[PDB]
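tokens incoming
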């Protein structure tokens, strides 16, 4: 439905109030049910008005004007709802034409550290709320972990690049505002072994289904059997995976043993039976000779000896009858061995490709993920197909930058906060002699977790952060993932597939150049470096890593089909001092609760230091939309503090 759709698109239950809304509207929850239903219609319809046309600001007046009777009659309640939705960034977020021009007098000075998606989102909110906002950004560009390369006709994203489903996704609004060219991804993904041979369909499917089985089993171990702590250590996903593979191998070796035991027993029965038939032939040779050695006692001796001979012959025919039903049991046993091994060497390499794919998705070796909690955010996935940004994801943060006071090449080195306000100190990256001191009422830190983890610290906090916050920083995972961009003058791959796989030869190197994407109009290929390989590969020069790409591609399509690339680019997210990795993951011994701790502001009294970024939002970590939502959350929190809730 339409207004139900608006609630769903806002990640809200269309038919009940959230706890957050109960807090802000306690008179509604305690009042009659009828008024609660009126509240919900006001909320849903306001969201619908905004979502149907997010390119312009939705004002209170226009909300009142577009409500049908009787709802356009309860003006006070309508205003209460509009104000709440706006303050929480559920309407009038992103980039839109203002109806009310910006207030000329500001209220409060906010420094935003970082011009990534979270910092930009907060800046636009706070600027809309009438505050003085300045962004300090260490790079020479906006977007942070959204990073688009452009050269000639080539466009390619080195950081984020996928919009997951639009249903419920706030990026669906931003897409409409910015004109992102999104394109659905085709799901077919052929695999090629390290020799360039295609993985046959049956092997592709067999190994994939086993991957699904093993993984569901780790989840059963974790959430049914509570196998989460061992020898005082938290179990990792990698650890659980090794255990379930060990049990399959044990099972194969057992059925093999059971089968050899059946073989041996049948051989032993045949050995004995043949020995027994031997002795019955010997007995018949003896009677057949005493049958030729032969009166009334003789006429009766032949009758009796024929009776004896043909009875031993009937004994012998019944034993050769058992002899046949046994050596046919033997024949069919020798023809149906169970599997010699659980995974053939090739099967194992392909399976390591699926593990690598998972290390891509989580940006970290499987041996680091918390078994119990690595996918705690699964329940919040958006609906609809995933898409890629054909015109480059930088289109989003560049649009978010319009009108913001952004000082680029301004690297924060120290953050001071007291009960009287804050000071941020920064240097010019083109001249680290030049120093700047920014006083403000509040600091919003969107520094990546990797930068916060840096020892010795890149940015120093004064006073130092509390233990409950720093140990949360320490506990959380911060992964890595890299891309190689290959620009050619001709397309030699299958244009109708967006993905294809290179199966690495070893477990340790399973993440090396394992997945290739063709996602664009122009002849571009991205090859991913995941897992253990990601950090190690940063130490390889560009030309050499491209060469290894080219060798893989020449193996698959033929050496003469692969020309020299016209342009190449290589990400090194771990070595990037403004990233120090790609995005958080739930490390073994952490949990969603650490993401909640990260969002918590510090108070030295009133809060001064605030936190946003993908690492602060429990239900949507490690994503652009989660960063965005986190910026919206902190903008609401800061405005509630400094302008009143
Ligand atoms: C890195 C990365 C990559 C490579 C990729 C990706 C990613 C990443 N992701 C994530 C995102 O990006 C995040 O979440 C965001 O970004 C967040 O944000 P924030 O928070 O805001 O942060 P930043 O940006 O960084 O910002 C901050 C700032 O700050 C600054 N600084 C520093 N230092 C300093 C400063 N300033 C001053 N001072 C000082 N000292 C910096 O510089 C900055 O600026 C993502 N996401 C999403 O959503 N999407 C996507 O797409 C992504 N990605 C990925 C990963 C995983 O796997 C993903 C995916 O995949 C896709 C693909 C690719 F990528 N490639 C190829 C193919 C495909 C998917 F699918 C999904 C997802 F979810 C993810």
């Amino acid at each position: 439905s339409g207004v139900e759709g608006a609630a769903f698109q806002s990640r809200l239950p269309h038919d009940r109030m959230t706890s957050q809304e109960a807090a802000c509207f306690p008179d509604i929850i305690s009042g009659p049910q009828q008024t609660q239903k009126v509240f919900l219609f006001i909320r849903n319809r306001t969201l619908q008005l905004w979502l149907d046309n997010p390119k312009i600001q939705l004002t209170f007046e226009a909300t009142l004007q577009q409500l049908e009777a009787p709802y356009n009659s309860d003006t006070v309640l309508v205003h209460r709802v509009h104000s709440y939705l706006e303050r929480h960034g559920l309407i009038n977020f992103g980039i839109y034409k203002r109806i009310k021009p910006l207030p000329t007098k500001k209220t409060g000075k906010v420094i935003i550290i970082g011009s990534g998606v979270s910092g930009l989102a907060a800046a636009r909110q706070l600027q809309s709320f009438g505050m003085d906002v300045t962004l300090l950004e260490a790079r020479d560009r906006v977007g942070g972990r959204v990073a688009t390369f452009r050269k000639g006709n080539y466009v390619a994203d080195l950081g984020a690049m996928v919009v997951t489903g639009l249903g419920g996704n706030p990026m669906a609004v931003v897409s409409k505002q910015v004109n992102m060219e999104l394109a659905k991804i085709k799901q077919k993904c052929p695999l090629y072994e390290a020799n360039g041979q295609a993985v046959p369909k049956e092997k592709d499917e067999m190994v994939e289904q086993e991957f699904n089985r093993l993984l569901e089993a780790t989840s059963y171990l974790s959430h049914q059997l509570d196998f989460n702590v061992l020898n005082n250590k938290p179990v990792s996903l990698g650890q659980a995976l090794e255990v379930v593979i060990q049990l399959q191998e044990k099972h194969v070796k057992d059925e093999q043993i059971e089968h050899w035991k059946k073989i041996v027993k049948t051989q032993e029965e045949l050995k004995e039976l043949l020995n027994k038939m031997v002795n019955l032939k010997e007995k018949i040779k003896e009677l057949h000779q005493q049958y030729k050695e032969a009166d009334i006692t003789a006429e009766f001796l032949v009758k009796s000896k024929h009776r004896d001979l043909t009875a031993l012959c009937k004994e012998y025919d019944e034993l050769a009858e058992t002899q046949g039903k046994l050596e046919e049991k033997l024949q069919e046993l020798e023809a149906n061995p169970p599997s010699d091994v659980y995974l053939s060497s090739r099967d194992r390499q392909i399976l390591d490709w699926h593990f690598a794919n998972l290390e891509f998705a989580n940006a970290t070796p499987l041996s680091t993920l918390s078994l119990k909690h690595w996918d705690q955010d699964d329940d919040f996935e958006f609906t609809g197909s995933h898409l890629t940004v054909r015109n480059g994801y930088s289109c989003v943060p560049v649009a978010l930058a319009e009108g913001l006071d952004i000082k680029l090449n301004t690297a924060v080195r120290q953050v001071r906060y007291t009960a009287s306000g804050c000071e941020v100190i920064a240097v010019n990256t083109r001249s680290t002699s030049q120093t700047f001191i920014y006083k403000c009422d509040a600091v919003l830190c969107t520094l990546p977790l990797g930068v916060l983890k840096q020892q010795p610290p890149a940015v120093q906090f004064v006073p130092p952060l509390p233990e409950w916050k720093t140990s949360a920083v320490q506990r959380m995972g911060f992964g890595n993932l890299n891309k190689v961009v290959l620009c050619f003058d001709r397309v030699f791959w299958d244009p109708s597939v967006n993905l294809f796989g290179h199966v690495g030869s070893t477990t340790a190197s399973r993440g090396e150049l394992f997945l290739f994407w063709n996602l664009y109009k122009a002849p571009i290929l991205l090859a991913l470096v995941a897992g253990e390989a990601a950090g190690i590969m940063e130490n390889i020069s560009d030309d050499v890593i491209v060469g290894r790409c080219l060798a893989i591609l020449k193996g698959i399509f033929g050496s003469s089909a692969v020309p020299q690339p016209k342009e190449t680019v290589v990400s090194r997210w771990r070595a990037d001092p403004w990233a120090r990795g790609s995005y958080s993951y739930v490390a073994a011994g952490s949990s969603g609760n650490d993401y909640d701790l990260m969002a918590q502001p510090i108070t030295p009294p009133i809060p001064r230091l605030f936190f946003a970024g993908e690492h602060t939002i429990r239900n949507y970590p490690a994503t652009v939309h989660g960063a965005l939502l986190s910026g919206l959350r902190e903008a609401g929190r800061i405005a509630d503090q400094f302008l009143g809730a």
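note: Residues 1-108 form one domain.
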